[PDB]
């Protein structure tokens, strides 16, 4: 498969306009932004519309749509950004321009010449992870390991560092620096998170830290080592404890120039490479007992959810429970056992927000057993489920996946989410779809009835972001196949 | 099925005169007290005998038979209530002049919507407990849980409190009927091991539910649910401040009944799913299924250390008996079988509740090795007796060795019940009732028409149903253990 | 089968001349010392060569070859001795003579009279739960408490002069012929490796048993039983006070032999079933069976860190080898295989006892990956040898690494002697010293002995090609 850099300019624009590359959220399948991005693209190419930004016009206006995922802790959240589709296609068309994309593709090819390092996180155009398989394999060659991570790589990048990538001291770097400035209030504070476009930018400076670390490396003559990397997750292998310490002090020096540093918690020099190549949550998943009883397995999942809270391994181990739900036929003692399993899975979600897709699928399929067709009694248990889970402060990701099950059981009866009310407009077949408080067009010059803004408003209000053809083909309950792609 | 309060007087006395109703001991299946208790009922019915006790006639006499079960470790005392006094005390309760107003008090417990009980006696017929499955389902509604027990509930029930579940003010009712007759058989406590004594506990526990509901409605605390099983309390609320105020009212209403809370088992939880199952139930789920017999039996032994004297070990041992009965041939009988006998002998040495299932696999393990050689098999069973005889109680052991030794040989006991069962098994004439139950309180000397016609009914009536004994297996079957 | 003392004089020599009896060291199947020693015997019986020892001539000369096994700890190693073949067949013929053999068998038979003491570690002619563990488990039916100990360093601390005290009292003795024949073959305790030493160790061990029962019958203590394996004691009784006076008597009789009990492994156990099995065996039952190859091999690595250099881990790598041999085609050789080669390489680089089985899974794994291309495989074996040569001693590595290397293509005196017999060239140089023989190499006596050592092959070429390319589970299950 082709990575982002060994493909052509026309292929890079077509790749960046995919709903996959636009935003990598745990979103239902019926949401698809490809047609909207590909319509506003060809409209700029056909000169039907014109996108022309200005730092003065853009300063002081919030542009994007931010969705909050709890990630971990439940007192902290991650700000995933839905970039304005108008500014996104324009910003994709500008870096995919052959004048600068030629420089970008060859800058990545220079990272491949850095032969000591291995970046397994470069985006690609579509067992165990390669980051782990590459670490277990090099134990045959090296005995020691240095694992580390970056505190907030995406939120702490000094945006002016992009200029330091292509040129040194004092170019596509200034182009990148200037346009993350146009969004996010011209603060140079951070870069957005939740897009392949933003990931491709991160790997440019990640590979540049890789370039500059090798430059300090060769000056001190330490060339018998290897590095396996995935985003900010660094793993340096060598057979000399003295070398790793020097490489660590050089890696903290190069990060000191880009305004970053190592996570003191997740930074350690290791002697058992095989032990520390896997996460502790993935190790305990191996030892979990295989159960045939549903309640025995589901209760075992909850206990696993305490030792490893808000972990994606809990979703994998919950997804396999959902695999066995569709395989079973009759659920004996539905009046007693099903009610008990509902309270179990409701508590797993009340403490682990990452399990909203699977947990809603668990709550949906178990209710198709207790109430076959009586959707009225089904809706009361979801409202009971929502009343509990809504006690958390930021529950927008719940409302989106709660809507997937809601839309297939009853469309006639207020989600309070700008995206969810937009989906509901396209689900209820409304005349014009809402765009207010979803994406701000105030940066575009003119009035709402101006020949340009009203023409762009026609695209935002008529283009469907929901594949109603796929939605009608989707099953009544959430299937494991819809969640299996989230890994 | 129907509850104990959903029965009329004609079938309430029928339920109370069942062997399961009379005692709840882990007695073998060839001792059914149904024929004795139902025939002495007819004697009072057709005026053959007269049974009317008096506080002065009965004060100072140990009327009932007592069997000690260690429970954990500290040993409980289950009471085999005197059959004469039992049927008199059940007929007076099932009298329609009082049974109509005892079940009426049970019906008022049903109107208490916030409280949910599952420990009411149920007229039975010929996985996951409801106490846990109900609490697991309540995590959808509530988030906090308050779980306590009543410390020594049965041994410390104030006897005069039975009058308080009907009328509050006391001066010079079914409460006095129960308060007066319980003090006659005992002399402060309540006997254990009978479902009649459980129905009395549910009335005083149900009144606690009613009185707590009156105290919680005056304080305007409405959003909570209670799941109760006898002593075990579980209160569910979404408010940590409401939950520890209902607690302060529970200790007040239990403080007026001479009761208290087990402070060692009193806790306010947050994970309802976590503390809905006991620790023994959780670790039982995690256990690896071993195909090897010695590997599994050794794993069961290690479980008994981390969970001393628990019914989960009996359930985990009963699965090993099901595996033994499935086997038809075992190999390496020399070193492997002898090592397994030593493993189970150590389990019973520290887990007294494993006496039935421990003797079960021991007799089944011996038949796999020594075969039909009754001499070598019986001598090894006596070697097991000598080891376990060091423990203080072991009265239940003699009850269950009697079931094992009788099916392979005949002729000890050293127990009034064991010698009586042995007399009924060997088919003698006069069954020994001399030291089993004290009938001295029956006014009149021997040979008199009342005591002699009662002695004729205590000696000639068979409590050991021999047709069932002749239909069982030589070794203890897993089905027998499953009934307990 | 029959024990070592239940064999007559003629077969006792045939037993001591067997390769699995000459050495218990885990060696490849193509090594067979049965041909060399048994042909040296027939040379002594035919008077073609006469081995005459002298305490003055043998003094100041290392007569034997030694191979180091790490055992455990990795900073400590145990010296396994391949006794000199000439001195071995001589010293084997000396005690197996009917005059001195009848006295030894009459002594081992006296150990049978000690009904309270049962030994399951006497050497026996060949053909789950070990008997030391199964017997200790069944005794829980009779007794309640247990007292398990181990002599601190039994073999290396035996006073060689104590072999007389097992046949005489204080001060022509049969045990005296052993005190002088061990102090001659080594610069003056008992060596390690040969079953001849196991029989000598069991002599005084049975005498510790006889002398202990004298002190316990004197103190009117009799209601107890003892299960023993070599120096591993397990004393059972129903009286904790009796057990402390039995142990206090065991340290006395052991102190009379200059022997010590390990303080670290000494405890009066309240629970027999709990401590009847080693901890590594108890955790082996707790391990979850895995259908995935990598999930199993990673679980093996985790087990080796809680029980380092354990023979229980060897059994559990052997299960992995049996599963590899069953699989016809491998699943995803590009990524999954290269990782498993690193897992086993890290296990062998910290658990030296896993050198044989580990080399086996290394080779079988490369056959699934690189296939029949031996050039691409040899570069990985060199990568494995480099990672493991960082260990200090190795040697045992090189022995089991020849078995894989020499089977596909052609450091120590032993591994080059095997190399000589695989090229049909046989230099006995620097392997067994012969300088304790009168005359030079030109003299007929020494020249005739060099001929028998050089002509007889210690490697059976008919078995080498008969063996498989990779080390099979049937080879590692013997050890």
Residue numbers in the entry:
A (entry chain A): 32 to 157, 170 to 213, 223 to 465, 468 to 541
B (entry chain C): 32 to 104, 107 to 159, 170 to 215, 223 to 237, 241 to 464, 468 to 540
C (entry chain D): 32 to 158, 170 to 213, 222 to 238, 242 to 463, 470 to 484, 487 to 540
Can I see the authors' text?
Abortive infection (Abi) is a bacterial antiphage defense strategy involving suicide of the infected cell. Some Abi pathways involve polymerases that are related to reverse transcriptases. They are unique in the way they combine the ability to synthesize DNA in a template-independent manner with protein priming. Here, we report crystal and cryo-electron microscopy structures of two Abi polymerases: AbiK and Abi-P2. Both proteins adopt a bilobal structure with an RT-like domain that comprises palm and fingers subdomains and a unique helical domain.
We also obtained Abi-P2 crystals that diffracted X-rays to 3.1 Å. The crystal structure was solved by molecular replacement using the low resolution cryo-EM map. In the crystal structure of Abi-P2, no electron density was observed for the DNA, in agreement with the low Abs260/Abs280 ratio for this protein after purification. Abi-P2 adopts a trimeric arrangement that is similar to Ll-AbiK. The asymmetric unit for the crystal structure contained six protein molecules that were arranged similarly to Ll-AbiK hexamers as two trimers stacked back-to-back. Therefore, Abi-P2 also has the potential to adopt a hexameric architecture. The absence of DNA in the structure precluded identification of the tyrosine residue that is responsible for polymerization initiation. Two tyrosine residues (Tyr46 and Tyr61) are present in the region of Abi-P2 that corresponds to the region of AbiK that comprises its priming tyrosine. We individually substituted these two tyrosines with phenylalanine. The Y46F variant retained wild-type levels of activity, whereas the Y61F variant did not polymerize DNA, showing that the hydroxyl group of the latter residue is involved in DNA synthesis priming.
